Design a protein around this nucleic acid. Structure first.
Length: 59
RNA sequence: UGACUGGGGCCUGUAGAGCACUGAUAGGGCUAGGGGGCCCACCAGCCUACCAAACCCUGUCAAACUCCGAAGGGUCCCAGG
């Protein structure tokens, strides 16, 4: 799977519980933090959900 | 095993729409009664740009109407986590 690279770039302060929890699923705690993740449809499913807080690249 | 997410299988009567049921409805057709002119009381008879059921056509309304009906949500299984 051509790996996904994600960066948290907006504060989740003010968004719903579940959205903050998807970030948690991903392992994104801090702002500007980047994580490299395999491209399974469950990984994608969550990143879909927090699309508006994250920029996404391919590796 | 968690929150959250992917793939499946059930359950549901809202948004929206509709008039088959319950009721409401504007106009026209068709047509019981009743009013009233022609008229005879021996009771019949003909007409009326009157009020008007039931029924049909056109046009619509409804938390306590529904022939119909999403997005979603609920739950169970397999996974990621």
């Amino acid at each position: 799977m051509p790996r996904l690279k994600v960066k948290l770039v907006k504060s989740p302060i003010g968004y719903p519980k579940d959205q903050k929890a998807a970030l948690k699923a991903l392992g994104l705690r801090r702002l500007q933090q980047e994580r490299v993740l395999e491209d399974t449809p469950a990984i994608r499913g969550n990143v879909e959900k927090v699309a508006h807080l994250v920029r996404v690249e391919v590796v």
